[PDB]
């Protein structure tokens, strides 16, 4: 009982229940909020 993906190669040697959780390849980036009134003083230089 673990986060073990159901794959063909594994299924050929063990039995797997139907999936208890879905997943897929996704993207992780270093950062979704950024105020700072200093984004207004930037466009037109001090």
């Amino acid at each position: 009982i673990a986060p073990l993906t159901i794959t063909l190669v594994r299924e050929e040697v063990i039995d797997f229940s139907k999936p208890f959780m879905s997943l897929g390849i996704s993207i992780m980036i270093k950062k979704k909020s950024k105020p700072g009134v200093f984004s207004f003083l930037d466009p037109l230089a001090y």
């Binding site: 993906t5 159901i6 039995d15 897929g24 390849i25 996704s26 993207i27 992780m28 980036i29 909020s33």
Partner: protein, 210 residues
Amino acid sequence: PRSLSGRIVGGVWWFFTLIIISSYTANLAAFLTVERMPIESAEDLSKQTEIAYGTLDSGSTKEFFRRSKIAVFDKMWTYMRSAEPSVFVRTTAEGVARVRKSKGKYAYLLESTMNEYIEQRKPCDTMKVGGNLDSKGYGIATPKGSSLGTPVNLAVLKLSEQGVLDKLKNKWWYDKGECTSALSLSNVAGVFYILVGGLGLAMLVALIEF
């Protein structure tokens, strides 16, 4: 009226401020255009090389890209396999640490479940972007011919239908967590305070006049 002297002054000063406000507008458009240019999908990744990106050094995610016949994914593979220094990591924890310690120059391709879990962990400096690239599933395993197999599968269908698996994921990902499109109010707010400040200054100049 038509005091030619100070007349051209008002005209030239107008042309002067016209250029400036035009510059401010144009430049401000660029800060938002580039802000979108800064990764939101595989396609974004596939298109550049300022931000390096890789996957676990061995495993199904690396293979997915190696074998893929989809144009975006094949472009990402030819880049990755030749990238130097190596964009592949020995462990998943390394790929997460690499994202966190690369100062915005590294993106990691990992399983959605893990990505969304780290997003809810302090220091709250990572983010999951784009839709899933493929679909897989976790399953409970037993030796072949096991007497436990039938019952255990039925149990998973049941727990899913009772909505229990969803409760469990929310409990461990979100309840125990530690952390859309367009513009923000932040920047615009700064201009609101300077306005009220001007109004107050006037309300002060008014009182003294009377």
